[PDB]
């Protein structure tokens, strides 16, 4: 039993991480095939002030890139912006390139961060995309270009590359096509995150995990209809539930309907009264139904 | 900024994981050199009742072990108990054996779990050893033999192998020498965990992490001497602080003395008053000083 936020194993991704430096900027790149993908601000003269990315590309020189993995030094033969990323053609193919695909994650979806520090994989942890396109991680100077990935059905997808932190501490990155999640600019200027909308699907999964774990104190002899919950969610910064299909197995195994748990959300959002659920002191929307089923039942 | 419980990358460990089955029992083994190490209960006829491990070894047959990694099947040529583990000599050397050492972790120390499901590495997360020798993870049937490890100064240490869950949900395992942490028996019978003693060193590190993060609401114009704190800790299920050396850098960078944070512990242990620190609702002892310095400053 137990519920922990996990990451999928990082081995397949680690050999793709390189150090990319330009001038005094140092970050990470993703070396796949004969390309290195990294955040384009590595070439900016001064990342502490608003950047004119036209001017930075105008004055770039390919020779000034310093890209390395251990004792392998990679020369840049072509450089393009692709959205907020640089795509750098290099003079060597990564012999450890894994089979892979690219996709974008959506709000409420979980994925893995390989946190890399000036070219060195340092740690791995799980995240969940928030409604405004942000994650709550732990990133510092030297960790841009850290890679997010997810394995599905034996297929490796690259889904995230790290770019910046907002003034409220939320973390912002892009897909590997260089589209920033949430639409944020790759600038140091103040950008607001709007209101965080909790993932109702994930809160339902969390309450199911507690029930699987034998923790049932919060369930009452009450239950809320789906339309009723959705009308409440729309004014309480929770998402509307569009389908209950993701909960069929959880409901069958625990014996608790989704609607009982919807009533629990509305009641518990007012506060836990000093109690905890799975050691949390308030509702948690970081776990998907899939994540809960996998770690608590060991299936799909 | 931010603080997350992380794991060190798992790639070096993943190629060492094998499926070990005997009869109807299925768990994981650690294949290093020409040895596979696994929990000895894989050979027990009925793990739901007290096991006479003499009787199970008496009736073992080497041919009945089924050990595999992908399309590699390993034959057992010798079997010994070493404490609560089996050490199995096999007929092939693991060509992906990493350089490694063995050591034991101590209460308050962090390490990484590679959670493995019937021979397949599934996920990786960080843990911290509790005073009674337990961890709070997420383990289910099929995950025994999952491996705990820590990288220090480029050296890989294997430190934990998973065996059982106590009635209160705490997780129990052994070192790779087969000594069970906490002294628990590898039996399904009720075993109590005594009182959990919080790691004061780690709580101090957690409060420093909050201060590094710019969260300072909980500090007051008060400070508690070291002997005074230790007398309080001894009757409040916290460890005594033996040395402040681990906090020199944290204190220098934040400007806050250890003694200010000791006063914070005594005050906050009575409750956070509905507030949070780094999103937690009560004090957290899962992070070491080293962990905080590494992820928040990127040093050693």
Author numbering:
A (entry chain A), B (entry chain A): 1 to 300
Article, verbatim:
Coronaviral Mpro is a 3C-like cysteine protease that cleaves the viral polyproteins (pp1a and pp1ab) at evolutionarily conserved sites to release non-structural proteins which are essential for viral replication and transcription in host cells. Due to its indispensable role in viral replication, evolutionary conservation among coronavirus genera (alpha, beta, gamma, delta), and absence of mammalian homologs, Mpro stood out as a promising drug target for developing pan-coronaviral therapeutics. In this study, we present crystal structures of Mpro from the feline coronavirus strain FECV-UU23 in complex with four clinically relevant inhibitors: GC376, PF-00835231, nirmatrelvir, and ibuzatrelvir. Our structural findings reveal that the active site of UU23 Mpro maintained conserved catalytic residues in addition to distinct, lineage-specific structural plasticity, especially in the loops forming the substrate binding subsites.
Analysis of the UU23 Mpro cocrystal structure with GC376 revealed covalent bond formation between the aldehyde warhead and catalytic C144, as expected. The P1’ position was further stabilized via water-mediated hydrogen bonds of the backbone oxyanion with H41 and G142. The γ-lactam P1 group of GC376 established multiple hydrogen bonds with residues F139, H162, and H163 in the S1 subsite. The flexible leucine-like P2 group was restricted into the S2 subsite mainly through hydrophobic interactions with L164. Notably, in this complex, two water molecules coordinated interactions between GC376 and T47, further stabilizing binding of the P2 group in the S2 subsite. These water molecules are missing in the SARS-CoV-2 (beta-CoV) structure where the P2 moiety has a slightly altered orientation and the S2 subsite is more hydrophobic and smaller, mainly due to the larger M49 and Q189. The P3 benzyl moiety was bound in the UU23 Mpro active site in a conformation similar to that in SARS-CoV-2, with conserved hydrogen bonding of the backbone with E165. This interaction together with minimal vdW contribution from the S4/S5 subsites oriented the P3 ring proximal to the γ-lactam. The overall conserved binding mode across these variants is in agreement with the overall broad-spectrum activity of GC376 against coronaviruses. Our results confirm the lower nanomolar potency of GC376 (IC50 ~12.4 ±  1.3 nM) against the FECV variant, reaffirming its established efficacy against FIPV (IC50 ~130  ±  20 nM) and SARS-CoV-2 (IC50 ~26.4  ±  1.1 nM, 190  ±  20 nM) as well as broad-spectrum inhibition of 3C and 3C-like proteases including Mpro.
